[PDB]
Design an enzyme around this catalytic site. Structure first.
Site, PDB file in Angstrom:
ATOM      1  N   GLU B  19     -43.871  37.989  67.658  1.00  0.00           N
ATOM      2  CA  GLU B  19     -44.660  37.105  66.878  1.00  0.00           C
ATOM      3  C   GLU B  19     -45.100  36.097  67.643  1.00  0.00           C
ATOM      4  OE1 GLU B  19     -41.465  35.116  64.584  1.00  0.00           O
ATOM      5  OE2 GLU B  19     -40.633  36.960  63.993  1.00  0.00           O
ATOM      6  N   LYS B  33     -45.679  32.791  71.861  1.00  0.00           N
ATOM      7  CA  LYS B  33     -45.344  34.030  71.856  1.00  0.00           C
ATOM      8  C   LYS B  33     -43.707  34.510  71.790  1.00  0.00           C
ATOM      9  CE  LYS B  33     -46.216  38.892  72.802  1.00  0.00           C
ATOM     10  NZ  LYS B  33     -47.009  39.952  73.595  1.00  0.00           N
ATOM     11  N   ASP B 134     -54.079  46.491  79.748  1.00  0.00           N
ATOM     12  CA  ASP B 134     -54.031  46.611  78.224  1.00  0.00           C
ATOM     13  C   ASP B 134     -55.266  45.752  77.546  1.00  0.00           C
ATOM     14  OD1 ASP B 134     -53.287  47.476  75.454  1.00  0.00           O
ATOM     15  OD2 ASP B 134     -51.688  46.542  75.719  1.00  0.00           O
TER      16      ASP B 134
HETATM   17  C1  LIG Z   1     -52.910  38.107  72.354  1.00  0.00           C
HETATM   18  C2  LIG Z   1     -51.818  37.380  72.997  1.00  0.00           C
HETATM   19  O1  LIG Z   1     -50.974  38.274  73.621  1.00  0.00           O
HETATM   20  C3  LIG Z   1     -51.599  36.089  72.817  1.00  0.00           C
HETATM   21  C4  LIG Z   1     -50.125  35.368  73.415  1.00  0.00           C
HETATM   22  C5  LIG Z   1     -50.109  34.004  73.414  1.00  0.00           C
HETATM   23  C6  LIG Z   1     -50.858  33.499  72.418  1.00  0.00           C
HETATM   24  C7  LIG Z   1     -51.893  33.779  71.800  1.00  0.00           C
HETATM   25  C8  LIG Z   1     -52.712  32.996  71.043  1.00  0.00           C
HETATM   26  C9  LIG Z   1     -53.143  31.859  71.332  1.00  0.00           C
HETATM   27  N1  LIG Z   1     -53.729  31.097  70.305  1.00  0.00           N
HETATM   28  C10 LIG Z   1     -53.702  31.990  69.365  1.00  0.00           C
HETATM   29  C11 LIG Z   1     -54.307  31.910  68.045  1.00  0.00           C
HETATM   30  C12 LIG Z   1     -54.113  32.988  67.082  1.00  0.00           C
HETATM   31  C13 LIG Z   1     -53.470  33.904  67.574  1.00  0.00           C
HETATM   32  N2  LIG Z   1     -53.082  35.015  66.867  1.00  0.00           N
HETATM   33  C14 LIG Z   1     -53.295  36.228  67.015  1.00  0.00           C
HETATM   34  C15 LIG Z   1     -51.772  37.044  66.064  1.00  0.00           C
HETATM   35  C16 LIG Z   1     -52.057  38.665  66.365  1.00  0.00           C
HETATM   36  O2  LIG Z   1     -53.312  39.200  67.199  1.00  0.00           O
HETATM   37  C17 LIG Z   1     -53.071  38.474  68.557  1.00  0.00           C
HETATM   38  C18 LIG Z   1     -53.290  36.760  68.379  1.00  0.00           C
HETATM   39  N3  LIG Z   1     -53.021  34.107  68.973  1.00  0.00           N
HETATM   40  N4  LIG Z   1     -53.196  33.348  69.526  1.00  0.00           N
HETATM   41  C19 LIG Z   1     -52.222  35.154  71.857  1.00  0.00           C
END
Ligand SMILES: CC(=O)c1cccc(-c2cnc3ccc(NC4CCOCC4)nn23)c1
Ligand SMILES: CC(=O)c1cccc(-c2cnc3ccc(NC4CCOCC4)nn23)c1
Lengths: 297, 297
Positions: B19, B33, B134
């Site tokens: 998530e 995350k 990746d």
């Molecule tokens: C891509 C990765 O691994 C990762 C890890 C931590 C934070 C973030 C991060 C930071 N700021 C944002 C804003 C929106 C968002 N939403 C999507 C949800 C599904 O697709 C991937 C990102 N993520 N995200 C991304």
């Protein structure tokens, strides 16, 4: 991170377990365990327990932080804890003898730490039930007040009555062979029953009780410090060495004759025998040992 | 810990990866995350890289903290980072079209992040060489300034010229199948040569360049957002689906005819073809792509 701000002042141990250091953080003494590169899974488990469970207790080594840091251009895993100048119970027992009060303080404090690990507490104060799986005199530290605290939760197993789920982790490390219970050595241990793991801890505790009792003065005499089974296995004994001794021959540490001339040591001998039943189900629980030690004087 | 003090405000994604949440820490926005329970090794690797290497860069997702915490009475592994409201490049490309300046800003920023990963820097400023393994539009975030930053280092591999040692980690996860290079799909990749891994990243980058270029306006027209190989494999394609397409048929994404009527898109097409040589050795490096993109306008 805490790691970046720590000054390593003095290495107090180095071995297969990695290294343990006295350091300073914000000018106070701390202990730093740096894990061997083969033992990331133990670091991961202790970090997990200490971060996810409410484990503050007088007889459980107090956690400060866990970090990853770079040294010699490679990754080190650090556990940072309270520092106990008196060192391990293993080394301490070799450097002094104990009177009746000091002996009972030590062994009671250990059973109180173990009982606290072993029980599940509910409410927002709570914690799952935890079995240790590598209890030994070297994994117990002595505090200036004469009580002990239990360290090294890298093999711990946990259980929750909510989900009735047992969490064994995924660590290839096994306990110290010298202290392994027959059902571990036999490989007949019921790995799905949490009680099995507590019972393994009780066996090991019995052995530690024996180690401590040898150093209690009665009639002005003591035994020399010896490890369990010192007379039947070599240093660094093998699974097979231990199995032959514990499972096939069915040996137990010998009680010195002199313990039977003293009422505390006779009680302690009875207690340790009830930790060493071959039948894991017959062994005492940590709570019962603690109540009995609260009664001895 | 940072985890205990974070308020999870809004979940922005949930899937096989765990998530991702918008939360607040000290009243500022952060991303959190939370890893799937099957993916502890990715959390461990990102935590390792971000804690042990000096990885601050405008085009690499900025790290704040990594923690273990308890939720629903079980362990969660958290990565906490800067929060990027514009979200992923994957989702963003589906919601807007790009002019020439915006397109080139995006792809240059990505090659600058990748080149920074790929190079070893020495001195106390330094960092090992890092391959991603990746790379994809979903692992790239868009910033309000229109540049991107690269995320998800859970499969990263590292190399140091000092020891000439390659550090591959021990993670069973493999890259996203759709973006896998032929030598990965073939299983002929030389796993002992660091250059192999950088070359895998270049292939994937070629594919991302294709995805972005489709959304750049020329003569007032654009293509619809499509993932690489959308016309030849299903959703969630198998190893075998990809191998047949990439290794046996030897297909590459088709270049729209209209790109050949525009000089930027003709350059970008040439660049992507030089990322897609079947022969990994013939592919451009990230540094060369960055210099070429600094020259296109
Ligand atoms: C891509 C990765 O691994 C990762 C890890 C931590 C934070 C973030 C991060 C930071 N700021 C944002 C804003 C929106 C968002 N939403 C999507 C949800 C599904 O697709 C991937 C990102 N993520 N995200 C991304
Ligand atoms: C036993 C364990 O796992 C652990 C972990 C972290 C810190 C500590 C800790 C705290 N305060 C001290 C003082 C001396 C000390 N030295 C010995 C070195 C070899 O035998 C074991 C301990 N350790 N230690 C112990």
């Amino acid at each position: 991170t805490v790691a970046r701000d720590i000054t390593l002042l003095e290495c107090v141990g180095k071995g297969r377990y990695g290294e343990v250091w006295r350091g300073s953080w914000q000018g106070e003494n701390v202990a730093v365990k740096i894990f061997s590169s083969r033992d990331e899974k133990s670091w991961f488990r202790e970090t997990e327990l200490y971060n996810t469970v409410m484990l503050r207790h007088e007889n459980i080594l107090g956690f400060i932080a866990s970090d990853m840091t770079s040294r010699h251009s490679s990754t080190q895993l650090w556990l940072i804890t309270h520092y106990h100048e008196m060192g391990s119970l293993y080394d301490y027992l070799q450097l002094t003898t104990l009177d009746t009060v000091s002996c009972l303080r030590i062994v009671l404090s250990i059973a109180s730490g173990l009982a606290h690990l072993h029980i599940e507490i509910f409410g927002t104060q709570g914690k799952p039930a935890i079995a240790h799986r590598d209890l030994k005199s070297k994994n117990i530290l002595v505090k200036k007040n004469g009580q002990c605290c239990i360290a090294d939760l890298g093999l711990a197993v946990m259980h929750s009555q909510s989900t009735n789920q047992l969490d064994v982790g995924n660590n290839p490390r096994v306990g110290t062979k010298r202290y392994m219970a027959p059902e571990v050595l036999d490989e007949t241990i019921q790995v799905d029953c949490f009680d099995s793991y507590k019972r393994v801890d009780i066996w090991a505790f019995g052995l530690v009780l024996w180690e401590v009792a040898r150093r209690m003065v009665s009639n002005g005499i003591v035994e020399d410090y010896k490890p369990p089974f010192y007379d039947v296995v070599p240093n660094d004994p093998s699974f097979e060495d231990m199995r032959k001794v514990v499972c096939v021959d069915q040996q137990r540490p010998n009680i010195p004759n002199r313990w039977f001339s003293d009422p505390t040591l006779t009680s302690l001998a009875k207690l340790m025998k009830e930790c060493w039943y071959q039948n894991p189900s017959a062994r005492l629980t940590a709570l019962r040992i603690k109540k009995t030690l609260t009664k001895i004087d």
